[PDB]
Write a protein that binds this ligand. Structure first.
Ligand SMILES: O=C(O)CCc1nc2cc(Cl)ccc2s1
Ligand SMILES: [Zn+2]
Ligand SMILES: [Zn+2]
Ligand SMILES: [Zn+2]
Length: 101
């Protein structure tokens, strides 16, 4: 690989004290498949191969960075790239613990 930095990492917000639920369904269509969590507002929406609700959320909010609940990758919609950075480690780890632990 991912980009080791991107100019949208500044928009990554603190993780809610409720933590993450990697089984959370899409907030629009309720699908349990291929969801992502927004790293600005922590809403959960489905991927491009389901109903494209996270891409819609990007369009209507401008929020840049999203975390996959399938493989814990982080995608930036502006840079059109995967990103990994020390600034993403806390949220990936919280997600990894919820998913696997
Ligand atoms: O599915 C989503 O809306 C968000 C996440 C991603 N969007 C893309 C688009 C391409 Cl072209 C390749 C990889 C990814 S990861
Ligand atoms: Zn959806
Ligand atoms: Zn958002
Ligand atoms: Zn970016």
């Amino acid at each position: 690989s991912p980009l080791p930095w991107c100019p949208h990492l500044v928009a990554v917000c603190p993780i809610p004290a409720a933590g993450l639920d990697v089984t959370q369904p899409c907030g629009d269509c309720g699908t349990i498949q291929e969801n992502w969590v927004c790293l600005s507002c922590y809403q959960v929406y489905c991927g491009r191969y389901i109903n494209g609700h996270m891409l819609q959320h990007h369009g209507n909010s401008g929020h840049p960075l999203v975390l996959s609940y399938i493989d814990l990758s982080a995608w930036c919609y502006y840079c059109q790239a995967y990103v990994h950075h020390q600034a993403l480690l806390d949220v990936k780890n919280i997600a990894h613990q919820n998913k696997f632990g």
